[PDB]
Amino acid sequence: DRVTTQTAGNTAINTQSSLGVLCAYVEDPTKSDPPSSSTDQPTTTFTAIDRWYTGRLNSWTKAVKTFSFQAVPLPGAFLSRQGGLNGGAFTATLHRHFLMKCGWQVQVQCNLTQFHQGALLVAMVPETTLDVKPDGKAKSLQELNEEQWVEMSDDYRTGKNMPFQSLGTYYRPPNWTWGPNFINPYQVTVFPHQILNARTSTSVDINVPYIGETPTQSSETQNSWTLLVMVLVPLDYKEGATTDPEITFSVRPTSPYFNGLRNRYTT
Amino acid sequence: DRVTTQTAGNTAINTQSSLGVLCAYVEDPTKSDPPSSSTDQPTTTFTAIDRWYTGRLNSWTKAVKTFSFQAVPLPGAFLSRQGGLNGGAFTATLHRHFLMKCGWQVQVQCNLTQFHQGALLVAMVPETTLDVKPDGKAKSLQELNEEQWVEMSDDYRTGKNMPFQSLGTYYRPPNWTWGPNFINPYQVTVFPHQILNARTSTSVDINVPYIGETPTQSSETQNSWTLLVMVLVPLDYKEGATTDPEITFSVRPTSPYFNGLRNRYTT
Amino acid sequence: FCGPMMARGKFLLSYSPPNGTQPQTLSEAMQCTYSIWDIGLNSSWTFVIPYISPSDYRETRAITNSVYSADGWFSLHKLTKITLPPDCPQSPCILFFASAGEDYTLRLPVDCNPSYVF
Amino acid sequence: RGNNGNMTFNYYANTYQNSVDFSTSGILNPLGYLK
Amino acid sequence: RGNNGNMTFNYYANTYQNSVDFSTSGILNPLGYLK
Amino acid sequence: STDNAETGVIEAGNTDTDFSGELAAPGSNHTNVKFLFDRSRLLNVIKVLEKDAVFPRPFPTATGTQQDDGYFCLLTPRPTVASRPATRFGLYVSPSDSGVLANTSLDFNFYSLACFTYFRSDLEVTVVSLEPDLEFAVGWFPSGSEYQASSFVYDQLHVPYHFTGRTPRAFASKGGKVSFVLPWNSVSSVLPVRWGGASKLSSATRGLPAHADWGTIYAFIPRPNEKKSTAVKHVAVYIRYKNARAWCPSMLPFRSYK
Amino acid sequence: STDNAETGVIEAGNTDTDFSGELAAPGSNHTNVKFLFDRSRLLNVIKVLEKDAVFPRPFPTATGTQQDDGYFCLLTPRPTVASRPATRFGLYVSPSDSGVLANTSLDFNFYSLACFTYFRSDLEVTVVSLEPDLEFAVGWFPSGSEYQASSFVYDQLHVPYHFTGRTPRAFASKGGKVSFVLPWNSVSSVLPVRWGGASKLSSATRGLPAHADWGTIYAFIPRPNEKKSTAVKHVAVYIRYKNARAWCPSMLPFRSYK
């Protein structure tokens, strides 16, 4: 029934209030074809990278307003080690390949009690730059610690604070008003999403395939999928209850096809 | 005929004066059974550790006397990086497993001209501690550089300078006279050996299987095979010839069966 | 888990193979063999510790400590903190058992220790 | 059989006298095969 | 049969060696059966 | 896996039950009850008779009664005192005092793996001497008999009555040993390692089985009473439980934490 | 004939290969490994226990520790020192000095034809006395056990705990010998004659196998501790490798040229 144990490799996780694995865009997203933009033999999956990678996410208080979100880039969380999410045998292989191509199977745990209210919107958003600061560089670990939650201002709703190339002193700098990597917060449920309600479940189960402009994108730069935990209804609890419930997430890369072996990535 | 190209993985090496691959103790030492002292699924071979690992060895002068040798421990050369022999995807996997079990397939190149004389004795010696200093610790990179060649003294012929546990001040310390990890230099040809003569070949080709007291030994401590380059006839050349011919060696681990995945080895 | 029924939470049950130093961080036990245990309608979890050994048998009396007698550490981390509702007793109690597997085998009887009779 | 001249009768069985190996599942060959 | 390596020949009979019970008329089962 | 230990039955699982592994081959069966107890061990160091003895009077014993203590070996793994079955086991810590120091015995190797309640086995007694070149003789009398304690005059030599008898008096040779297997002779069907009943009805001690034994052996020098020496000679009693059968699983003794 | 010894395989030829001759009939097979090692030889002259001993403390040992040296025979052809496995073999040249002269042993007949690396055989121990008319007793404890070192009081005689046990304590007769074949009991599959690995991980000695042995026998007079004599008695240990199997050809020791 509602007790699903998902054994993968050696790291098997459990849940007793599951809603069902939201397989996205296909029936079985585990099945995937090898890339057609490579002539060398691809490093397929093996039993050290077919496993669940559990990380941490920032806590969730009453001070979190509506639509204050928190983005986890994939596989950008393996590189920067966001939330302590260390890949181990996957990060040490993804730094030694130029073309990576995998589908993701994420699972966000957040254990609300029957006396709490509030609802997360855990969604897998394709192709956004929500981690990257508008100057052009990605956020560090302290910058993902000083704020704990990215507030949905006018710049995120419209698409105004996305990174850009500066025009220079020759041109007159325009009034920047729009950019196509916006968030429409009222329309995040078009993405593969499950609501982590306080009264139905403690873990959402999303399964996404590989999408991308090329049959295999780069390894050290891609932002194909992006885990996006958005607060729809703010947290509320009477005093005496368990304060600030923590949020985790478990990521399993389904069927990776690495290509282009080279040495470890040094800028 | 005498032109054998040995394609393995992506690193294919060549030789045009080969004598033949000395398969040792069996017909096909590539075939090997999984270990029977493990219940978890072993990490078998894959196309990043089935390749040739070329390193360097110290040069060979006229000042090298008879039986001055130079030992390469396997897989001890992957850990300490002896001669620049970096394993890459093999060292980064052997540090993350507790039980390693592989056969070796070595190949020592040393290009003497038709006007040089001298003959190396390239042999694969099982179970010796020839790298380890008699105090108990192994040699560093500078200690394998300050001498360039380990001279066959009375302590190496007899077995007197092998490492030991000190008895302490309670016992009277004996006169140490013998120990079973000696070298009998007149009897190194019992081992799987090929003579690297100056007038027949430039590369010897040895292929050894896994041997050991357990069905799979440890990873960070074992010294199952030991490449042993011994100078039988000293180098001689008239003046004007190419001085000090360099020695390389190419090591390919045939059929490794890793077991016991843990994190990277920290003392 | 011998706590109240309304308690929730998750526990991490990580067996580590023998290493140079016992793991302490949750990220150092996540890399080992673990199993995240949930609290709910059922209240037990039989964590079968695997038999990872460089020999066919292991010693059972670590006089001189080695890899033949000590087979690494067991470690129970609390993954998420236990969320107790109001008016429920703080600090519940996890109760441990120790059975043997269905393939547990023994060999070579030796002399006992009469230290109980003293 | 080695240095055993007792061709006739073994009193103790083969498991007690010798020590067999538990299962997992004239002509002198050379020790080095040129291939 | 226990710790008995004498597979061949018993000199004394089964009543003298052992002690049988007078009549009135691999697989290890569990010691507790949930029903 | 997800189980319930409150139920009382927890099915033993392999590594493959929760993880991706396999089984291990069952190597040896040295945990077999008939194999584990089939080996000799020291039971009691008893002294050798030199005269027509007196069997020790039952408890409690007042002073002045001339009996013979520590000469009889009550063949039982349970705690004994003064060659009679007891319940508590006592040993002496400051023994160099007055009174009669009673012989207490216990099977140390038995209770460490007596994880059961009931037990039945044919005992194999071996009586090894603790004297250089001693010729002795081993008496016996079964579970439910008593020691015939007098001496009949044979040619003006007081031969005691424990030479003769229908019970096996096995004679050792000079420097030899004694070894004879005793059957299960008790009136009980099995030997209770742990017992909670009472044999008598009035003034009974709870937990003291009356006839949970294989009898009582003793050692005696096969010379008449006129050839009684002075120096006391000891002898050691080794027992082996042939054809052991153990029922009703139970506890093991409390290993201390100091 | 015209050959190539650089290749590493040199086919052994007869006289008829190069000359006009014939073959010779193969007479005997005394080079068979199972036949060659199946014969007894002196291993260690060890001293006989007279009291509840102490197993020697592991290396290095500081002064003042009251242990018992040279009383235990570590059944291994490898070099030992103070009844523990070692790597270098040492013997005393000017032994009449201070300190404790450690017992070192080596199998001299083994290494002269130990032209191999690995070895597995069922050992056959014979314990011959070096004392006129001695009654002794041979203990044993396997590869991976330890010596139970105390004494339990039996009838005010301090009987040590190495009389009892589940391991074979074979008792010699007065003027007799002890002979019992020991199986291959080590945790290793084979015994490395030459070893280059390390058993431990930190502070390990390279080339010292921890459990390449058949255990450790000892000799003890079967009298209690109150009957301890003064004059030290020796005993000799003869071993035989039944059913020997040797793998991985290797070197022979360096015969000197002086």
Provide an overview of this structure:
The PDB classes it as virus. Keywords: virus. This is part of a larger assembly, with two copies of chain A (267 residues), one copy of chain C (118 residues), two copies of chain D (35 residues) and two copies of chain F (258 residues). With 267 residues, chain A is mainly beta. Chain A has one domain: Jelly Rolls, CATH 2.60.120. Chain A contains three helices and 14 strands. Chain A starts with a strand and ends in a 6-residue tail after the last strand. Helices cover 4% and strands 15% of the residues of chain C. In chain C, strands 2-1-4 form a three-stranded antiparallel β-sheet. The longest helix of chain D is centred in the middle third of the chain and has 4 residues. At the B-G interface, strand 9, strand 10 and strand 12 of B face strand 5, strand 13 and strand 15 of G. Strand 9 of chain B pairs antiparallel with strand 5 of chain G.
Most extensive protein-chain contact, per-chain counts: B-G, 68 and 66 residues
Name the quaternary structure: part of a larger assembly
Percentage of residues in strands of chain A: 25-35%
The CATH architecture assignment of chain A turns out to be: Sandwich
**Number of helical elements of chain C:** 1
| Strand order in space, largest sheet of chain A | 3-10-7-13-4
Strand content of chain C: 15-25%
Number of DSSP helical runs of chain A: 3
For the termini of chain A, the CA-CA separation is 50 Å
| Helicity of chain A, as a percent range | under 10%
> What is the succession of H and E elements of chain C?
EHEEE
Give a topology summary.
The structure is cut from a larger assembly and holds two copies of chain A (267 residues), one copy of chain C (118 residues), two copies of chain D (35 residues) and two copies of chain F (258 residues).
Chain A: E1 4-6, E2 13-15, E3 21-23, E4 53-57, E5 69-74, H1 76-80, H2 91-94, E6 97-100, E7 103-109, E8 117-126, H3 154-158, E9 193-197, E10 203-207, E11 217-218, E12 225-236, E13 247-254, E14 259-261
Parallel strand pairs in A: 3-10
Antiparallel strand pairs in A: 1-2, 4-13, 5-12, 6-11, 6-14, 7-10, 7-13, 8-9, 8-12
Chain C: E1 10-15, H1 26-30, E2 36-38, E3 44-45, E4 74-80
Antiparallel strand pairs in C: 1-2, 1-4
Chain F: E1 2-3, H1 15-18, H2 33-36, E2 41-49, E3 72-74, E4 80-81, E5 84-85, E6 104-105, H3 108-111, E7 116-129, E8 137-141, E9 151-154, E10 157-160, E11 170-171, E12 178-182, E13 191-192, E14 216-220, E15 234-249
